[PDB]
Design an enzyme around this catalytic site. Structure first.
Site, PDB file in Angstrom:
ATOM      1  N   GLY B 113     -21.253 -22.777   5.133  1.00  0.00           N
ATOM      2  CA  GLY B 113     -21.212 -23.967   5.980  1.00  0.00           C
ATOM      3  C   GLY B 113     -19.861 -24.161   6.647  1.00  0.00           C
ATOM      4  O   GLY B 113     -19.780 -24.438   7.853  1.00  0.00           O
ATOM      5  N   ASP B 132      -9.357 -22.044   2.461  1.00  0.00           N
ATOM      6  CA  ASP B 132     -10.187 -21.378   1.453  1.00  0.00           C
ATOM      7  C   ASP B 132      -9.334 -20.832   0.320  1.00  0.00           C
ATOM      8  O   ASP B 132      -8.280 -20.237   0.552  1.00  0.00           O
ATOM      9  CB  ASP B 132     -11.042 -20.230   2.036  1.00  0.00           C
ATOM     10  CG  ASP B 132     -12.178 -19.788   1.081  1.00  0.00           C
ATOM     11  OD1 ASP B 132     -13.024 -20.622   0.700  1.00  0.00           O
ATOM     12  OD2 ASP B 132     -12.245 -18.593   0.725  1.00  0.00           O
ATOM     13  N   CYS B 154     -26.163 -14.035  -1.922  1.00  0.00           N
ATOM     14  CA  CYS B 154     -27.301 -13.421  -1.225  1.00  0.00           C
ATOM     15  C   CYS B 154     -27.035 -11.971  -0.840  1.00  0.00           C
ATOM     16  O   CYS B 154     -27.920 -11.112  -0.963  1.00  0.00           O
ATOM     17  CB  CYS B 154     -27.639 -14.176   0.068  1.00  0.00           C
ATOM     18  SG  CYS B 154     -27.001 -15.861   0.247  1.00  0.00           S
ATOM     19  N   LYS B 157     -26.510  -9.417  -3.951  1.00  0.00           N
ATOM     20  CA  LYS B 157     -27.747  -9.465  -4.727  1.00  0.00           C
ATOM     21  C   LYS B 157     -28.908  -8.782  -3.984  1.00  0.00           C
ATOM     22  O   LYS B 157     -29.689  -8.047  -4.601  1.00  0.00           O
ATOM     23  CB  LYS B 157     -28.058 -10.922  -5.100  1.00  0.00           C
ATOM     24  CG  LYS B 157     -29.171 -11.559  -4.323  1.00  0.00           C
ATOM     25  CD  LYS B 157     -29.670 -12.850  -4.927  1.00  0.00           C
ATOM     26  CE  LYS B 157     -30.495 -13.621  -3.873  1.00  0.00           C
ATOM     27  NZ  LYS B 157     -31.272 -12.575  -3.201  1.00  0.00           N
ATOM     28  N   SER B 290     -33.539 -19.279 -14.103  1.00  0.00           N
ATOM     29  CA  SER B 290     -33.432 -19.613 -12.690  1.00  0.00           C
ATOM     30  C   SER B 290     -33.740 -18.395 -11.823  1.00  0.00           C
ATOM     31  O   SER B 290     -33.891 -17.271 -12.310  1.00  0.00           O
ATOM     32  CB  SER B 290     -32.018 -20.110 -12.404  1.00  0.00           C
ATOM     33  OG  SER B 290     -31.087 -19.096 -12.795  1.00  0.00           O
ATOM     34  N   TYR B 291     -33.817 -18.618 -10.506  1.00  0.00           N
ATOM     35  CA  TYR B 291     -34.025 -17.480  -9.621  1.00  0.00           C
ATOM     36  C   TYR B 291     -32.866 -16.493  -9.725  1.00  0.00           C
ATOM     37  O   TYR B 291     -33.072 -15.285  -9.576  1.00  0.00           O
ATOM     38  CB  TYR B 291     -34.254 -17.950  -8.170  1.00  0.00           C
ATOM     39  CG  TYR B 291     -33.027 -18.386  -7.376  1.00  0.00           C
ATOM     40  CD1 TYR B 291     -32.248 -17.444  -6.710  1.00  0.00           C
ATOM     41  CD2 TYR B 291     -32.662 -19.722  -7.276  1.00  0.00           C
ATOM     42  CE1 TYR B 291     -31.139 -17.807  -5.959  1.00  0.00           C
ATOM     43  CE2 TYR B 291     -31.531 -20.108  -6.527  1.00  0.00           C
ATOM     44  CZ  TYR B 291     -30.782 -19.132  -5.870  1.00  0.00           C
ATOM     45  OH  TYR B 291     -29.670 -19.444  -5.119  1.00  0.00           O
ATOM     46  N   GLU B 295     -33.685 -12.630 -10.706  1.00  0.00           N
ATOM     47  CA  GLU B 295     -33.310 -11.616  -9.726  1.00  0.00           C
ATOM     48  C   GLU B 295     -32.369 -10.578 -10.339  1.00  0.00           C
ATOM     49  O   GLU B 295     -32.561  -9.364 -10.165  1.00  0.00           O
ATOM     50  CB  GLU B 295     -32.670 -12.296  -8.511  1.00  0.00           C
ATOM     51  CG  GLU B 295     -33.709 -13.013  -7.615  1.00  0.00           C
ATOM     52  CD  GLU B 295     -33.054 -13.747  -6.454  1.00  0.00           C
ATOM     53  OE1 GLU B 295     -31.821 -13.901  -6.503  1.00  0.00           O
ATOM     54  OE2 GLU B 295     -33.748 -14.168  -5.501  1.00  0.00           O
TER      55      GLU B 295
HETATM   56  C1  LIG Z   1     -26.376 -15.367  -7.198  1.00  0.00           C
HETATM   57  C2  LIG Z   1     -26.702 -16.204  -5.985  1.00  0.00           C
HETATM   58  C3  LIG Z   1     -27.636 -15.735  -5.066  1.00  0.00           C
HETATM   59  C4  LIG Z   1     -27.971 -16.484  -3.933  1.00  0.00           C
HETATM   60  N1  LIG Z   1     -28.909 -15.972  -3.051  1.00  0.00           N
HETATM   61  C5  LIG Z   1     -29.221 -16.685  -1.988  1.00  0.00           C
HETATM   62  C6  LIG Z   1     -30.198 -16.139  -1.056  1.00  0.00           C
HETATM   63  O1  LIG Z   1     -30.784 -15.061  -1.162  1.00  0.00           O
HETATM   64  N2  LIG Z   1     -30.440 -16.955   0.042  1.00  0.00           N
HETATM   65  C7  LIG Z   1     -29.849 -18.187   0.296  1.00  0.00           C
HETATM   66  O2  LIG Z   1     -30.183 -18.795   1.321  1.00  0.00           O
HETATM   67  N3  LIG Z   1     -28.936 -18.697  -0.586  1.00  0.00           N
HETATM   68  C8  LIG Z   1     -28.640 -17.963  -1.673  1.00  0.00           C
HETATM   69  N4  LIG Z   1     -27.715 -18.458  -2.567  1.00  0.00           N
HETATM   70  C9  LIG Z   1     -27.097 -19.755  -2.272  1.00  0.00           C
HETATM   71  C10 LIG Z   1     -25.967 -19.649  -1.261  1.00  0.00           C
HETATM   72  O3  LIG Z   1     -24.964 -18.756  -1.750  1.00  0.00           O
HETATM   73  C11 LIG Z   1     -25.346 -21.031  -1.064  1.00  0.00           C
HETATM   74  O4  LIG Z   1     -26.372 -21.967  -0.740  1.00  0.00           O
HETATM   75  C12 LIG Z   1     -24.270 -21.073   0.020  1.00  0.00           C
HETATM   76  O5  LIG Z   1     -23.264 -20.096  -0.264  1.00  0.00           O
HETATM   77  C13 LIG Z   1     -23.674 -22.460   0.132  1.00  0.00           C
HETATM   78  O6  LIG Z   1     -22.512 -22.412   0.988  1.00  0.00           O
HETATM   79  P1  LIG Z   1     -21.432 -23.566   0.957  1.00  0.00           P
HETATM   80  O7  LIG Z   1     -20.713 -23.486   2.305  1.00  0.00           O
HETATM   81  O8  LIG Z   1     -22.090 -24.864   0.541  1.00  0.00           O
HETATM   82  O9  LIG Z   1     -20.393 -23.107  -0.191  1.00  0.00           O
HETATM   83  P2  LIG Z   1     -19.806 -21.696  -0.637  1.00  0.00           P
HETATM   84  O10 LIG Z   1     -20.538 -20.592   0.059  1.00  0.00           O
HETATM   85  O11 LIG Z   1     -19.791 -21.687  -2.176  1.00  0.00           O
HETATM   86  O12 LIG Z   1     -18.315 -21.738  -0.112  1.00  0.00           O
HETATM   87  C14 LIG Z   1     -17.371 -22.721  -0.598  1.00  0.00           C
HETATM   88  C15 LIG Z   1     -15.991 -22.103  -0.602  1.00  0.00           C
HETATM   89  O13 LIG Z   1     -14.974 -23.125  -0.784  1.00  0.00           O
HETATM   90  C16 LIG Z   1     -14.018 -22.641  -1.705  1.00  0.00           C
HETATM   91  N5  LIG Z   1     -13.297 -23.775  -2.290  1.00  0.00           N
HETATM   92  C17 LIG Z   1     -13.682 -24.571  -3.341  1.00  0.00           C
HETATM   93  N6  LIG Z   1     -12.827 -25.527  -3.630  1.00  0.00           N
HETATM   94  C18 LIG Z   1     -11.809 -25.350  -2.698  1.00  0.00           C
HETATM   95  C19 LIG Z   1     -10.598 -26.036  -2.470  1.00  0.00           C
HETATM   96  N7  LIG Z   1     -10.189 -27.091  -3.187  1.00  0.00           N
HETATM   97  N8  LIG Z   1      -9.805 -25.596  -1.463  1.00  0.00           N
HETATM   98  C20 LIG Z   1     -10.205 -24.547  -0.740  1.00  0.00           C
HETATM   99  N9  LIG Z   1     -11.323 -23.825  -0.864  1.00  0.00           N
HETATM  100  C21 LIG Z   1     -12.088 -24.277  -1.868  1.00  0.00           C
HETATM  101  C22 LIG Z   1     -14.819 -21.780  -2.674  1.00  0.00           C
HETATM  102  O14 LIG Z   1     -13.985 -20.916  -3.444  1.00  0.00           O
HETATM  103  C23 LIG Z   1     -15.740 -21.048  -1.684  1.00  0.00           C
HETATM  104  O15 LIG Z   1     -15.109 -19.922  -1.082  1.00  0.00           O
HETATM  105  C24 LIG Z   1     -27.344 -17.722  -3.716  1.00  0.00           C
HETATM  106  C25 LIG Z   1     -26.399 -18.187  -4.628  1.00  0.00           C
HETATM  107  C26 LIG Z   1     -26.076 -17.444  -5.764  1.00  0.00           C
HETATM  108  C27 LIG Z   1     -25.053 -17.977  -6.733  1.00  0.00           C
END
Ligand SMILES: Cc1cc2nc3c(=O)[nH]c(=O)nc-3n(C[C@H](O)[C@H](O)[C@H](O)COP(=O)(O)OP(=O)(O)OC[C@H]3O[C@@H](n4cnc5c(N)ncnc54)[C@H](O)[C@@H]3O)c2cc1C
Ligand SMILES: Cc1cc2nc3c(=O)[nH]c(=O)nc-3n(C[C@H](O)[C@H](O)[C@H](O)COP(=O)(O)OP(=O)(O)OC[C@H]3O[C@@H](n4cnc5c(N)ncnc54)[C@H](O)[C@@H]3O)c2cc1C
Ligand SMILES: CC(CO)(CO)NC(=O)Nc1ccccc1
Ligand SMILES: CC(CO)(CO)NC(=O)Nc1ccccc1
Lengths: 587, 587
Positions: B113, B132, B154, B157, B290-291, B295
């Site tokens: 996001g 980050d 994603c 995996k 969980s998924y 997986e």
């Molecule tokens: C094993 C696994 C498999 C998945 N497979 C899928 C799939 O097949 N399809 C799918 O649609 N979704 C999948 N997901 C879910 C998907 O990864 C998440 O929904 C998505 O990454 C969410 O993005 P985000 O931007 O909310 O946060 P994130 O992608 O987690 O990014 C947040 C970032 O902010 C950083 N951060 C945290 N705190 C701070 C701070 N204080 N200062 C600076 N940086 C910070 C973190 O280290 C990280 O880099 C999977 C998740 C997992 C764990």
């Protein structure tokens, strides 16, 4: 219109019961019929908003207005008391079997459409016969029940495509960590053919079993319609006889064409022979440029063969030509040779070895538009230059069934020919997409209108397709050039993008080769007129979007839907680059 | 409402031009801005049905009613003459760079996001910074820019799932005629890990390049919001400082949970460690259901591993439970062992060998609901027992951002928190589907509303999903049990069927295992409330139907659409067996 519909339904239904779900007299009639094994259609008037009016119209045939009312072949048989009277006196079987004709339905042709139509008709009590015969190819090839798709079409062609795809799976598996050496692995053509043919044999047998379990009479005989209701049949022993039927469905399909050049019939083969070939083709020339030509050339090359395609003008005439060019470019980069702007003028050098199961050897002579001569040796030559019906073998001209200039049957939008009890479905129906799910929907929907009072027609518009070339091409709706021809260039917007499957990254395959586009109409809320995708699993990608296009999807509908990640198909949900903008579609 | 919208747009846009496409004075302003490399939003009033009213409302800020009008950070800057005046006197760069704050936007978190939001905002002239930092796992694992999906989600995996799928491709290839012997081929874990990590590294680098090419400032630093507009940053050398921004987007994601039992943190691992593991896992226990748990267990077993999953109660809580049971049954038949109704109470027997790259050895003790004890040795133990944010490390409680009982951010339907310049997207947004395409759509749509006057909201309803277990499970909409809970059993009809992929026939795989269903609402024209499919390529199958469901597809829409043959997805177009009827769904 209610009265017109009821009259057509009563005249054509074999055995039909008018009922209400809450009537115990209706229940007792259903139970008697079910005990005597009398199959029939049922129309529940309390589930139709128009049922009170239908109940009144029934009195024109029966002189009563109550339910249940039971009809056999256009005649009112009785209410509850009358039906149970016939049953008690062992009169019922005789009444429900009484006909002017041997059969309520005769289907000439046991393929995709014909089998679907005959099985569905039998469910409603129509006494049905299915006729099927396979005229041997020039070299003598023949096959069992089920038609072109099952035996020499979609089914074996996709299984051989899968065998070719697995060559690239073997290559990819090294990069994903598996210890095999692709360069030491070979393919055995006849081992694959035996497995494919064992599956086809299970389908031949399953169809004979299904017909028997639906009480359909299967005749392995050539049919010829000699009058509206009479079919002359010739069996395997050349014995000739005549059977009669109320409704007739013509469902006889097409066969491959040959060019009129010396040696073509004697020494070449077609797709009809390829899928059961007892010898490996070897170095192969494919003459033609249809989806059949390119699909066959494509899997032969992926299995390891030396393959050339000889093209008179363009590839995939009638399909979107940008898309067709990308299909052919991929094939050329992955082994297929193309002799462009070239036509053939075939000499035999070696006869096929029916003992060691090895191919022969042929000399092909032809010429290019620039005046150069073509002359090259090949072990096998496959003609894929179109398909045609031969309805003069099926249909006496005196019956009165109207044909078009290509010899296909001219039908109304409910498949009726110019002879009102005779219908045509599948590839011989003029103007319709020539595909197996279309023939099946046509045949099943027609059987329900004939014998169960249904009204629903088959919708032939925006039917989706997939060409199973080495990189697959799926489409639904208009090509870009047809959309611009219809509405003008100023009214058309095209969104497009390249993409790369995630599976291709670790395998080190190509970056900007897969491709997709949405062709839209500006002045109709950006309605999607055509969808096109080049990539793996393109048939799985395309199918679901065909429902949305049927419903009138716009670009805004694609934008508001969220993608599934990681998939190839999700790239359709985020398209933004237009062709008018000139911005590159590459990643 | 026009006036409310205009006021919100002017206050928040960084640099915005009101224009008409046919005005040469507007063109000259665009050209001057393009020459000085000043990025900006543009709103063409002649392409809005409401544009004449917008033109009048502009006068509340500028006291004029003509176009062009240019605004910077809530202030009217000038018409055409005024803008060219600033340019001629080398005053323009100073005016368009003047701010109360260091940045127009600060994004805390560089994941799915956050990266999407920051890149889109920069397109409209918002001076943007992306922060980050990756807090190391207990054993010390860390990774580069791009968030959970790119690095430990994603992307790796699905690549490891592809490596597992290729094991069955190798098996199938023998039946299709290829000369390999599957039983003599092995898998090398670290060769696969190196290839996966080389792709992830290309994504880390591509994101840094993309940010630089959009003029976004990337800081590899931990961010903490200490007041509405101030972010305290700590860098890699522990140096602490403060930066300010107008709008703030919280996008920090979640991290895996551990159970509170001895040995769990010291000796087990999570998905965060698995995808870059330098040694092969060996005999593995997965704790969870969980998924993520299923997986990971699934591909480890397909690669050849001895795998057990220990399940407290049910699989895939929150998903359709019939579907989840079929997923687990397939896995159990294909090698995965399941310790059912079992929880853990971890002892170390061997330390990980960081020299020969080999795993350690662990003793796991637990207990079953029937009182029996669990005690077994494993080389690797993976916890997949959920994920959680730790917003107390991101957000000072005195700022005033409201959290729910699970510690996620409570937002309005436009992602606004209880602090009006602060927004939250992705996994930390309470109540939303936790998926990568959702986070990307949220972030991009939010950036356009903040800085380009857009109005479109993200639609979080009926978002499709796919679980990439060995046999994949795709879905869109309600589970069967949730539909019956909402509308009652009498109002729900379920159509279903088994199927067999054509590719499984020659390969001798299972007949009646793949499965699909449509859950429909009788009293709303048989509206499709949920679609479910278990089979190969389930994500490709499902995606396109999500557009039709978004549009309100009914069963009749599925029936009138024609299938593509031969495909798995085409079985959705011909469904007819209902659950209420009791007729078997098998083929
Ligand atoms: C094993 C696994 C498999 C998945 N497979 C899928 C799939 O097949 N399809 C799918 O649609 N979704 C999948 N997901 C879910 C998907 O990864 C998440 O929904 C998505 O990454 C969410 O993005 P985000 O931007 O909310 O946060 P994130 O992608 O987690 O990014 C947040 C970032 O902010 C950083 N951060 C945290 N705190 C701070 C701070 N204080 N200062 C600076 N940086 C910070 C973190 O280290 C990280 O880099 C999977 C998740 C997992 C764990
Ligand atoms: C190489 C190839 C690949 C194809 N791939 C696909 C694909 O992937 N997808 C797709 O949707 N479509 C595909 N098609 C098209 C598909 O095969 C046809 O659209 C479909 O088979 C049409 O069915 P039909 O019922 O009209 O006729 P057919 O399936 O041709 O059946 C007609 C039958 O009637 C018999 N018959 C003829 N005359 C008589 C007579 N006088 N008496 C008795 N029996 C008679 C014929 O021998 C035949 O058995 C392919 C076709 C070819 C040639
Ligand atoms: C990109 C392009 C456009 O025409 C060449 O520039 N491709 C082809 O022409 N592909 C093709 C391949 C084999 C046979 C016929 C066509
Ligand atoms: C068909 C059925 C229904 O419950 C057994 O009869 N399946 C399961 O129970 N599958 C399952 C597998 C592993 C873990 C949990 C469940």
């Amino acid at each position: 219109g209610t009265s017109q519909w009821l009259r057509k339904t009563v005249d054509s239904a074999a055995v039909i019961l008018f009922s209400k779900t809450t009537c115990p007299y209706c229940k007792k009639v259903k139970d008697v019929l079910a005990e005597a094994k009398i199959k029939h259609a049922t129309i529940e008037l309390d589930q139709l908003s128009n049922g009170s009016a239908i109940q009144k119209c029934l009195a024109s045939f029966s002189k009563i207005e109550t339910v249940p009312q039971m009809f056999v072949r256009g005649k009112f048989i009785g209410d509850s008391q009358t039906v149970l009277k016939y049953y008690s006196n062992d009169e019922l079987a005789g009444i429900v079997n009484e006909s002017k004709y041997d059969y309520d339905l005769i289907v000439i042709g046991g393929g995709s459409g014909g089998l679907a139509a005959g099985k569905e008709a039998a469910k409603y009590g129509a006494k049905t016969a299915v006729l099927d015969y396979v005229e041997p190819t020039p070299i003598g090839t023949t096959w069992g029940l089920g038609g072109t798709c099952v035996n020499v079409g979609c089914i074996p062609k996709k299984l051989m495509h899968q065998a070719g795809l697995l060559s690239h799976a073997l290559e990819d598996a090294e990069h994903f960590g598996w210890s095999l050496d692709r360069s030491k692995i070979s393919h055995n053509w006849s081992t694959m053919v035996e497995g494919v043919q064992s599956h086809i044999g299970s389908l031949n047998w399953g169809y004979k079993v299904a017909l028997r379990d639906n009480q359909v009479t299967y005749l392995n005989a050539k049919g010829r319609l000699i009058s509206p209701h009479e079919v002359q049949i010739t069996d395997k022993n050349q014995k000739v006889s005549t059977i009669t039927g109320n409704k007739i469905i013509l469902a006889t399909g097409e066969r491959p064409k040959y060019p009129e050049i010396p040696g073509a019939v004697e020494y070449g083969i077609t797709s009809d022979d390829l899928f059961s070939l007892p010898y490996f083709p070897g170095k192969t020339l494919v003459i033609g440029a249809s989806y059949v030509a390119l699909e066959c050339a494509g899997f032969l090359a992926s299995l390891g063969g030396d393959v050339t395609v000889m093209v008179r003008s363009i590839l995939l005439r009638g399909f979107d030509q940008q898309m067709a060019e990308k299909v052919g470019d991929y094939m050329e980069n992955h082994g297929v040779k193309f002799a462009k702007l070239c036509v053939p003028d075939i000499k035999q050098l070696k006869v096929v070895d029916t003992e060691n199961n090895k191919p022969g050897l042929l000399l092909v002579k032809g010429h290019y538009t620039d005046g150069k001569k073509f002359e090259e040796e090949f072990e096998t030559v496959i003609f894929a230059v179109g398909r045609e019906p031969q309805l003069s073998k099926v249909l006496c001209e005196t019956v009165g069934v109207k044909l078009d200039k290509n010899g296909r049957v001219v039908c109304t939008d409910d498949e009726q020919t110019t002879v009102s009890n005779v219908y045509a479905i599948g590839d011989i129906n003029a103007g319709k997409p020539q595909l197996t799910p279309v023939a099946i929907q046509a045949g099943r929907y027609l059987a329900r209108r004939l014998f169960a009072g249904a009204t629903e027609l088959t919708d032939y518009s925006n039917v989706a397709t997939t060409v199973f070339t080495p990189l697959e091409y799926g489409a639904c709706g208009l090509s870009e050039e047809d959309a611009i021809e219809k509405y003008g260039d100023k009214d058309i917007e095209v969104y497009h993008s390249n993409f790369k499957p995630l599976e291709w990254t670790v395998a080190h395959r190509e970056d900007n080769v897969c491709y997709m586009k949405l062709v839209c109409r500006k002045s109709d809320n950006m309605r999607v007129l055509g969808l096109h995708v080049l990539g793996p699993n393109a048939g799985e990608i395309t199918q679901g979007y065909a429902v949305a296009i049927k419903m009138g999807a716009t670009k805004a509908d694609f934008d508001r839907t969220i993608g599934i990640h990681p998939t190839c198909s999700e790239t359709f949900t985020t398209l933004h680059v237009t062709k008018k903008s000139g911005v590159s579609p590459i990643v």
